[PDB]
Ligand binder design. Structure first.
Ligand SMILES: CCCCCCCCCCCCCCCC(=O)O[C@H](COC(=O)CCCCCCC[C@@H](C)CCCCCCCCC)COP(=O)(O)O[C@H]1[C@H](O)[C@H](O)[C@H](O)[C@@H](O)[C@@H]1O
Lengths: 55, 54
């Protein structure tokens, strides 16, 4: 019963569990985690990111 | 507690230099090209201007 409950709970919750620190967002310094990177992170070295006003 | 990194009284700074962006190596596989033409020479393309002065 303990093993079955362990397996079932883990299989129930592992779908939800995700790594926050999986490098996914590309960056000039290689793929990085989402929290480190924002829209201002240069995708490639020397990229121009204008401070565009949102009309 | 205060955050480890704060405050800088010295080193007033400098005016940022004029930004000179670089062509995208990642987004563009190669170099973006403008006018298209046969250009049976070293290469001139489909864009050629000139200003005739006095
Ligand atoms: C007693 C049980 C002993 C086992 C402990 C289990 C905890 C250790 C986990 C071991 C696996 C880690 C290495 C390999 C795996 C790995 O790297 O995955 C990580 C995440 O680990 C997972 O897989 C899922 C984690 C499992 C959920 C565990 C639930 C809590 C347990 C401890 C409580 C129930 C046990 C019974 C006790 C309570 C009894 C009741 C009184 C990160 O995911 P990520 O790289 O972002 O990819 C995402 C894919 O995982 C993701 O499933 C997928 O859905 C995507 O969303 C994807 O993005």
């Amino acid at each position: 019963l303990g093993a079955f409950g362990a397996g079932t709970l883990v299989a129930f919750i592992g779908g939800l569990i995700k790594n926050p620190w999986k490098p996914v967002v590309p960056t000039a310094e290689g793929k990085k985690a989402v929290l480190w990177t924002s829209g201002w992170t240069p995708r490639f070295k020397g990229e121009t990111i204008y401070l565009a006003r949102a009309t | 507690c205060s955050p480890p990194g704060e405050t800088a009284s010295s080193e007033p700074g400098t005016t940022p230099a004029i930004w000179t962006g670089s062509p995208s190596p990642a987004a563009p596989s190669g170099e973006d090209h403008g006018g298209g033409h046969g250009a049976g020479a070293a290469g001139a393309g489909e864009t050629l201007t000139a200003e005739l002065k006095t």
